[PDB]
Amino acid sequence: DHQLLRYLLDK
Amino acid sequence: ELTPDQQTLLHFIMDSYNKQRMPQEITNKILKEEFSAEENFLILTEMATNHVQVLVEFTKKLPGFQTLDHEDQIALLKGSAVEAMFLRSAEIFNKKLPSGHSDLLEERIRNSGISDEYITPMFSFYKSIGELKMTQEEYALLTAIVILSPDRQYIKDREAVEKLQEPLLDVLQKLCKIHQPENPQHFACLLGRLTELRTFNHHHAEMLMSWRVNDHKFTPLLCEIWDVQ
Numbered sequence: 377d378h379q380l381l382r383y384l385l386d387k
Numbered sequence: 388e389l390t391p392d393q394q395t396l397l398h399f400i401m402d403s404y405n406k407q408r409m410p411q412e413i414t415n416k417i418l419k420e421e422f423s424a425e426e427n428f429l430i431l432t433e434m435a436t437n438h439v440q441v442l443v444e445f446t447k448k449l450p451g452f453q454t455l456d457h458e459d460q461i462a463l464l465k466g467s468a469v470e471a472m473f474l475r476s477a478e479i480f481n482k483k484l485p486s487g488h489s490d491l492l493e494e495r496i497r498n499s500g501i502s503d504e505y506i507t508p509m510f511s512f513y514k515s516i517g518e519l520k521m522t523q524e525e526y527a528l529l530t531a532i533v534i535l536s537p538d539r540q541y542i543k544d545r546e547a548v549e550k551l552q553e554p555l556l557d558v559l560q561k562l563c564k565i566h567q568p569e570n571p572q573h574f575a576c577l578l579g580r581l582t583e584l585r586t587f588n589h590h591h592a593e594m595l596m597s598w599r600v601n602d603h604k605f606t607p608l609l610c611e612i613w614d615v616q
């Protein structure tokens with residue numbers, strides 16, 4: 377769940 | 388006024404807040420594209436979805452944000468993104484930012500499916516906040532403070548957030564004591580907007596509903612940050 381925010385935070 | 392850990396805290400923040408993130412190619416569309424209810428809505432959606440990214444980078448560069456729990460990191464972003472957006476658009480209308488294209492951005496918001504119930508308070512807020520004559524510093528620190536609010540729903544470790552918030556609220560007040568001795572009620576005026584921003588957060592869900600039932604798009608990202616089913 378809530379993957380894009382996760383992705384942006386770790387980029 | 389001005390301790391060494393505070394003078395350092397600010398210039399790291401005003402560095403992040405000035406990282407010119409919204410590409411001109413995107414923001415120019417406020418100017419050149421046609422003015423219709425549909426096109427106004429797409430452009431606004433495009434601005435917001437790009438800004439959600441600008442905010443996530445900005446929030447990343449906030450001191451100690453990455454030391455927080457991962458479940459708490461999302462909760463803050465989801466709860467504050469709307470309030471961060473009201474603040475940045477406010478800065479656009481107030482300080483007449485050239486990349487904002489103030490008048491035209493206002494025309495698009497005013498004709499994009501939003502009801503009068505929400506438009507009146509919106510620009511009432513914009514009007515009044517601008518009459519404080521906030522400096523860029525005041526805009527940045529409010530954002531960081533809005534993002535680092537522990538009051539949000541679904542937040543687990545609130546004391547850990549309050550620990551990151553406190554230093555900024557302290558810095559902001561010193562700035563008011565320094566640059567504004569003539570009126571010490573200035574700190575409270577700035578903090579007053581946090582509560583005003585909340586009333587809009589609460590209303591914002593209705594705005595999205597109105598759009599959704601009218602087959603309106605949004606983006607995968609906006610839908611994630613705002614729990615659009």
Ligand SMILES: CC(C)c1onc(-c2c(Cl)cccc2Cl)c1COc1ccc(-c2ccc3c(C(=O)O)csc3c2)cc1
Nearest residue numbers: 409414428431432434435438469472473475476486487496
């Ligand atoms: C359409 C939909 C997704 C929506 O729903 N509620 C709102 C909404 C509204 Cl209508 C009012 C207030 C807040 C929100 Cl979220 C919106 C549109 O939100 C915006 C988000 C972000 C910008 C925004 C940010 C930065 C900049 C910069 C810069 O950085 O240099 C230059 S141009 C610009 C534009 C504008 C509008």
